[PDB]
Design a binder for these strands. Structure first.
Length: 49
DNA sequence: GTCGTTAGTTGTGGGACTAAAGGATATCGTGAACCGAAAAATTAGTGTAACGGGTATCCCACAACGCTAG
């Protein structure tokens, strides 16, 4: 079962990588500053407190 | 009672499925007969030798002196 999972569940990984590359291909650092006052709040990641 | 509307199925159709190497296959069934086309093979027919001068070239050999007297 482990060997079959290894031999059959990497096509899904390749498909995911292909779709991710094609959706993210055009994202390139083009300028230096986007002059934004917006952002995200980052805090510590706690699992089971 | 009857007709159009909306939402939630339900069946059906079209589109995805790592990367590297390699990369050999075998492939039925039959109806006749004559005419035309062109591609190929076979057959029928004609022939030199030295000479005159004069001159272009070649190979092949040799020469291209030295002394004495009027």
């Amino acid at each position: 079962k482990g060997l079959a999972d290894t031999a059959l569940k990497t096509a899904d990984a390749g498909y995911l990588t292909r779709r991710l590359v094609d959706v993210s291909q055009d994202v390139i650092i083009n300028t230096e500053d986007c002059g934004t006052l917006r952002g995200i709040e980052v805090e510590a990641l706690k699992k089971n407190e």
